[PDB]
Amino acid sequence: KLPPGPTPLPIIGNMLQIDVKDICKSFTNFSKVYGPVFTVYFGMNPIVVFHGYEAVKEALIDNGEEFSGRGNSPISQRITKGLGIISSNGKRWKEIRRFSLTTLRNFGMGKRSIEDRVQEEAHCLVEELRKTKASPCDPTFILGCAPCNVICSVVFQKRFDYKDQNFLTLMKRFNENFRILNSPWIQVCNNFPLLIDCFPGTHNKVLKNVALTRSYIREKVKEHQASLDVNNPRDFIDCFLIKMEQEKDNQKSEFNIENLVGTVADLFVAGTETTSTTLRYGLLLLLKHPEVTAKVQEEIDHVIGRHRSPCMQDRSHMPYTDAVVHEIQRYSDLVPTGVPHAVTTDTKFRNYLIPKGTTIMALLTSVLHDDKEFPNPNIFDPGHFLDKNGNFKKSDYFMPFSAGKRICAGEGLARMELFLFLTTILQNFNLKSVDDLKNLNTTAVTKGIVSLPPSYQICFIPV
Numbered sequence: 001k002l003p004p005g006p007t008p009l010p011i012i013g014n015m016l017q018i019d020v021k022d023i024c025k026s027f028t029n030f031s032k033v034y035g036p037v038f039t040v041y042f043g044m045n046p047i048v049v050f051h052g053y054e055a056v057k058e059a060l061i062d063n064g065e066e067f068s069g070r071g072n073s074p075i076s077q078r079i080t081k082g083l084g085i086i087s088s089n090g091k092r093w094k095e096i097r098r099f100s101l102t103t104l105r106n107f108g109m110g111k112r113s114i115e116d117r118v119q120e121e122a123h124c125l126v127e128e129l130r131k132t133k134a135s136p137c138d139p140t141f142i143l144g145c146a147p148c149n150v151i152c153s154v155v156f157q158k159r160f161d162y163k164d165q166n167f168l169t170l171m172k173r174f175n176e177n178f179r180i181l182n183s184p185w186i187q188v189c190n191n192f193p194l195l196i197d198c199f200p201g202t203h204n205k206v207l208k209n210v211a212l213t214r215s216y217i218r219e220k221v222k223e224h225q226a227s228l229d230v231n232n233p234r235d236f237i238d239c240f241l242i243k244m245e246q247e248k249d250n251q252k253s254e255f256n257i258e259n260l261v262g263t264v265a266d267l268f269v270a271g272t273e274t275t276s277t278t279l280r281y282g283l284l285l286l287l288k289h290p291e292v293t294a295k296v297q298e299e300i301d302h303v304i305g306r307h308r309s310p311c312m313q314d315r316s317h318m319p320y321t322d323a324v325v326h327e328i329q330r331y332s333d334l335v336p337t338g339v340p341h342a343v344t345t346d347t348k349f350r351n352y353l354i355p356k357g358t359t360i361m362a363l364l365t366s367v368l369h370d371d372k373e374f375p376n377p378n379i380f381d382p383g384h385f386l387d388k389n390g391n392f393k394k395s396d397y398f399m400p401f402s403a404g405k406r407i408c409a410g411e412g413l414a415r416m417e418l419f420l421f422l423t424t425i426l427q428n429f430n431l432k433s434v435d436d437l438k439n440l441n442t443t444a445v446t447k448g449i450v451s452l453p454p455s456y457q458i459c460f461i462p463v
């Protein structure tokens with residue numbers, strides 16, 4: 001028996017009872033009436049939601065093996081075709097995600113570490129902010145390049161010149177497609193496929209952007225295979241090709257070109273817009289909270305100094321800054337409803353039974369905003385991650401990357417980009433607003449699977 005929930009309508013389920021513009025608002029509201037676990041229907045499809053740390057943990061963690069599946073929706077099926085790591089299941093997923101995790105270790109890609117590739121970008125990042133000559137600007141674009149280049153640097157040999165036209169279009173397609181798919185419309189179309197016909201232009205655009213993007217990713221593999229030296233890998237591509245060669249004999253090996261071009265793409269899409277969005281939400285919060293930013297700058301000066309680039313080792317000596325990066329992710333609440341899962345088999349969740357294949361949703365927001373774990377969860381405060389003596393306080397409720405067997409595969413890289421970008425920037429700059437900080441609103445604009453910070457201007461004044 002499925003978890004109780006609003007009784008649905010004959011064809012559209014509870015659709016005309018949910019705010020497609022702000023789903024969490026609708027879900028939280030259902031929890032006040034149905035409790036921690038409940039069922040809602042998007043059209044014909046049943047979806048069971050988990051609200052609050054207890055339900056979310058029990059699902060993703062305790063009953064982790066059951067809730068580690070990807071549902072495979074209509075839109076989803078014509079893009080990734082089940083290829084890769086974000087949209088794959090079973091044997092193929094376990095093998096691509098184990099390899100990926102292994103090669104995304106700081107030193108899993110040959111001699112140059114991931115950390116070195118990220119520091120180089122942070123430098124180029126501050127270098128671009130210099131070119132704004134301290135005038136007011138919207139950091140969306142420059143701030144969106146760095147995280148893109150990081151991936152480029154991780155899957156290809158060298159990074160791109162910010163002005164390298166080949167980099168720019170390779171960035172717009174991913175952005176363009178990201179904008180398209182982070183619309184409340186993908187929900188409607190995903191549960192009512194027929195509606196997709198009403199959007200030929202949009203549908204054609206996505207397809208084209210995916211063709212060009214994959215097409216370019218396949219070229220970079222051509223080149224890589226003609227210069228491969230199995231002894232010294234250069235990036236994610238080499239590490240994959242080497243693995244391929246080692247599996248060349250068993251013809252049912254998941255390590256084939258298709259999963260490669262697919263996995264690389266998964267890295268871009270899951271790794272660009274996300275950290276890029278968290279960074280942008282971060283500078284805004286530091287721009288609005290000068291008291292927090294000075295304290296951070298005081299740790300940089302003391303531990304890192306002003307001549308050398310910061311590095312991950314500096315975090316263990318900077319509990320305040322770390323707490324600021326942790327509170328930036330909690331507050332920004334990038335992915336409130338979390339990404340949907342599907343159960344691998346008939347599953348008994350405490351008192352109920354969830355049939356295999358059913359779509360599941362663990363509301364990360366409900367954890368990131370638990371008002372017992374983070375007193376006054378609606379206010380930005382590094383203190384939520386600091387104890388009485390100013391030491392870093394970790395929380396089991398810190399799930400901006402989700403939890404369980406499907407936790408973000410590049411969590412290590414997300415945090416490295418956040419730490420090294422924010423501290424490098426705050427070491428060479430101070431944040432000035434063109435107007436009183438009081439005017440500055442921090443309320444996210446939630447209109448899709450991914451929340452964005454409100455638009456804003458910011459002046460990067462060199463210290």
Ligand code: HEM
Pocket residue numbers: 085086087097266267268270271272274275276278334335338339340400401402403405406407408409410411413414415
């Ligand atoms: C601050 C930035 C980021 C945040 C908040 C974030 C968050 C998440 C979340 C919420 C998920 C879904 C977990 C689930 O299915 O339950 C996820 C998945 C994933 N992330 Fe990230 N992510 C970020 C950046 C990165 C980066 C930089 C990469 C790549 C190098 C990446 C790689 C992926 C991949 C491949 C998955 C799918 C994993 C799977 O289904 O097995 N992410 N991340």
Ligand SMILES: CC1=C(/C=C/C(C)=C\C=C\C(C)=C\C(=O)O)C(C)(C)CCC1
Pocket residue numbers: 069070071072073076086087269270273274335339340341342449450
């Ligand atoms: C990984 C990931 C993302 C992208 C998802 C992609 C490319 C496919 C999802 C397919 C699903 C969720 C299929 C299903 O189960 O029906 C977004 C950028 C939103 C946010 C951060 C984590």
Ligand SMILES: CC1=C(/C=C/C(C)=C\C=C\C(C)=C\C(=O)O)C(C)(C)CCC1
Pocket residue numbers: 073075076079173174177178181182186190209210213265269339340449450
């Ligand atoms: C499409 C899609 C979704 C949204 C993902 C987002 C926000 C961006 C995707 C970008 C891609 C798929 C880019 C590319 O590969 O070019 C969700 C998870 C709600 C459900 C399954 C279908």
Ligand SMILES: CCCCCCCCCCCCCCCC(=O)O
Pocket residue numbers: 198199200201202203
């Ligand atoms: C200031 C400009 C006002 C004009 C507002 C026009 C609003 C209509 C928008 C229609 C969008 C439909 C897009 C369909 C795209 C497709 O073919 O898939």
